[PDB]
């Protein structure tokens, strides 16, 4: 019954809030998707170990540099999120979020998560990105970034289709359990 804390970080529209909601409810909300996430305590059993995983969000704190670090105390695993339909949100991963998470959370495993992977095949996503001389984040660009920032690993998921969501959180539990 060990207790572990998980905090998800990332830019405004990286889908961190949708991801925590979809995992804690265990389905894509059919009628209404909530604007905000309060907190949750998930009961996870990974590789034979039972863990109470407390989930937290940093949405709303991105502009407040003194309030935001109050979410970090005693974090056991960091989910560093970016959105596959926003290659610019990936550029901020090593320049803004990594040095802050390493400063406040030394030696805490970080999993780089590419969210919204369904948008890699969406036509409106490609057409709009190509207007700004861009295209969806490629699987190798995510893996290289995780490698460069010294991440524990790289994962992709789609909160809209629920694909990869369960595996991200069970892996995060494993990462939190390593001494």
């Amino acid at each position: 019954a060990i207790r572990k804390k998980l905090v998800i970080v990332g830019d405004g529209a990286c889908g961190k809030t949708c991801l925590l909601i979809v995992f804690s409810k265990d389905q894509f909300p059919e009628v209404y998707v909530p604007t905000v996430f309060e907190n949750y305590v998930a009961d996870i059993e990974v590789d034979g170990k039972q863990v109470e995983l407390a989930l937290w969000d940093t949405a709303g704190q991105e502009d407040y540099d003194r309030l935001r670090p109050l979410s970090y105390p005693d974090t056991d695993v960091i989910l560093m999120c970016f959105s596959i339909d926003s290659p610019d949100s990936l550029e901020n991963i090593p320049e803004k979020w990594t040095p802050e998470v390493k400063h406040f959370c030394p030696n805490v495993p970080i999993i780089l998560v590419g969210n919204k992977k369904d948008l890699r095949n969406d036509e409106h996503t490609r057409r709009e990105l190509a207007k700004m001389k861009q295209e969806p984040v490629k699987p190798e660009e995510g893996r290289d970034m995780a490698n460069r920032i010294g991440a524990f690993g790289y994962m992709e998921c789609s909160a809209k289709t629920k694909d990869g969501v369960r595996e991200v959180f069970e892996m995060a539990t494993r990462a939190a359990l390593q001494a």
Binding site: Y32, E38, N39, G60, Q61, D63, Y64, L70
Partner: protein
């Protein structure tokens, strides 16, 4: 929370809270607006409840069952009485605005048309000044409250006994001492997100779109002032550490 309010805000949305034949009578844009307003009140009800767990369950229980200085309990629960009054008054104003909007013969069917006014009173003038001062005070004592809980939980067996005892119910799963403290620090940064999504579907009446635009600017001004006012306190800090 009180049973009446918990049932009124038990559904996942305004669409599911109201009767289906009442929902059918409204435009999609209104349903979308109502869903975000219902989420703002539902989360405010949960916020006030979190503060009652801190004041009535944790704070008062420690005073009545343990032998700790009143200074220890004050360091574990800074500003909780002031925060509880600020938000219980806000919640009363939001719940009354909903009640006034109820159809006669119904306790569940309503539509809130005016909201920007209530949000402007909460986040402007004297009331906003006290809330801003209260949040800079709370957030500057947040780390010290956490270290003090951990110091007492690892050195005091009777404090540990008390904690295991009052946090045993399943309803308290995500509401332990440190969780309540972060839930309260995170509350203020939620308001702009909810207000921005309410404004996104309030373009039908220009007086209302303007009221919500003013309210969005007021919460962001408040937040920036609370963020500027934070200077973290340390448990047992020396004077030399502070003036450097």
């Amino acid at each position: 929370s009180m049973e009446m309010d918990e049932k009124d805000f038990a559904a996942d949305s305004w669409s599911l809270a109201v009767d289906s034949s009442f929902l059918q009578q409204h435009k999609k844009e209104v349903m979308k607006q109502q869903d975000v307003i219902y989420e703002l009140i539902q989360t405010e009800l949960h916020h006030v409840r979190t503060l009652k767990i801190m004041t009535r369950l944790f704070r008062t229980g420690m005073l009545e069952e343990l032998h700790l200085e009143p200074g220890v309990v004050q360091g574990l629960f800074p500003c909780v009485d002031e925060l509880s009054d600020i938000h219980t008054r806000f919640l009363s104003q939001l719940l009354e605005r909903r009640r006034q909007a109820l159809c006669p013969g119904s306790t569940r069917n309503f539509v809130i048309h005016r909201l920007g006014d209530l949000l402007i009173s909460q986040f402007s003038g004297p009331s906003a000044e006290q809330m801003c001062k209260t949040y800079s005070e709370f957030c500057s004592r947040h780390s010290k409250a956490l270290k003090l809980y951990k110091e007492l939980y690892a050195r005091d067996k009777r404090f540990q006994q008390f904690i295991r005892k009052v946090t045993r119910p399943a309803v308290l799963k995500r509401h332990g001492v440190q969780e309540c403290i972060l839930l309260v620090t995170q509350r203020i940064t939620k308001y702009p997100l909810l207000i921005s999504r309410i404004l996104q579907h309030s373009h039908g009446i220009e007086e209302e779109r303007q009221d919500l635009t003013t309210a969005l600017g007021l919460v962001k001004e408040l937040l920036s002032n609370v963020d500027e006012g934070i200077y973290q306190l340390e448990k047992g800090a020396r004077l030399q550490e502070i003036y450097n």
